[PDB]
A paper describes a structure:
In Bacillus subtilis, Noc nucleates on 16 bp NBS sites before associating with neighboring non-specific DNA to form large membrane-associated nucleoprotein complexes to physically occlude assembly of the cell division machinery. Unusually, Noc is also a peripheral membrane protein that directly associates with the cell membrane via a predicted N-terminal amphipathic helix (Adams et al., 2015). We provide evidence that (1) CTP is required for Noc to form the NBS-dependent nucleoprotein complex, and (2) CTP binding switches Noc from a membrane-inactive auto-repressed state to a membrane-active state.
The asymmetric unit contains two similar copies of monomeric apo-Noc (root-mean-square deviation [RMSD] = 0.9 Å), hence we used the more complete subunit for all further analysis. Most notably, electron density for five of the 10 AA comprising the membrane-targeting helix α1 were visible in a 310 helical conformation. We noted that the hydrophobic face of the amphipathic α1 helix is buried toward α5 and α7 at the core of Noc and thus is unexposed and unlikely to be available for membrane interaction. Sidechains of F9 and F11 also interact hydrophobically with the side chains of I116 and I81, respectively.
Residue numbers in the entry: 5 to 225
Write the structure that this text describes.
């Protein structure tokens, strides 16, 4: 499990400061494919360009991590930004380290990398945490520790899955903030959550106003 959290540039740099650099291969750029288990990533082109400028001066401080796939192709485990950066530089080859990961591990890394890079919307974060917990028979604490997060960051997200559909839909549609949905969790009752949801959208209530209305509803006998 733990090694699936360790393939990104920062963590590879940290391990390499304690030991011999892994063997590097120079793989074809044309033969690289992004992780087939994560959706198409829409990067900030601005940040890919910053990264390309850094590499064109200072080299590629870490090789990407790939597994072998298909006929002589390489699937990214870590390094999609670097791969994108060296295309801007016109490279035909990129330094890489090859790891044998099975599909379940490659799928796990897809979720983990998406969590670490702070990509995901709240419900996406929730679904990713839920799946890593189910796949690996994990504690919320055990997962939070491995992600370098507080147990509450996980729980706040996992609880959004226990909310009713209408509230989840409102959060996904950005009709309410997460902190709105969070406060509605305290009501622990679908009917009250739905009535107060309609109020939030109709009167365009903020977080303070919603939290107050949740306390006043829970203060009732």
């Amino acid at each position: 499990f733990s090694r699936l959290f360790s393939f990104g540039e920062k963590e590879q740099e940290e391990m390499e400061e304690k030991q011999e650099r892994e063997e590097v291969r120079h793989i074809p750029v044309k033969s690289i494919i992004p992780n087939r288990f994560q959706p198409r990533t829409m990067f900030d082109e601005e940040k890919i360009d910053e990264l390309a400028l850094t590499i064109r001066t200072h080299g590629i401080i870490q090789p990407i991590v790939v597994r072998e796939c298909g006929n002589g192709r390489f699937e990214i485990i870590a390094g999609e930004r670097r791969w994108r950066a060296v295309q801007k530089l016109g490279w035909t080859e990129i330094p890489a380290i090859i790891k044998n990961l099975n599909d379940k591990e490659t799928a796990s890394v897809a979720l983990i990398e998406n969590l670490q890079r702070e990509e995901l919307t709240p419900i996406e974060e929730a679904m990713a945490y839920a799946k890593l917990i189910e796949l690996h028979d994990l504690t919320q604490e055990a997962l939070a520790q491995r992600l370098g997060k507080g147990q509450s960051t996980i729980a706040n997200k996992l609880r959004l899955l226990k909310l009713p559909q209408e509230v989840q839909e409102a959060l996904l549609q950005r009709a309410i903030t997460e902190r709105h949905a969070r406060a509605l969790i305290a009501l622990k009752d679908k009917e009250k959550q739905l009535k107060l949801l309609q109020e939030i959208i109709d009167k365009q209530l903020n977080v303070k106003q919603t939290e107050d209305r949740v306390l006043k509803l829970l203060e009732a006998g």
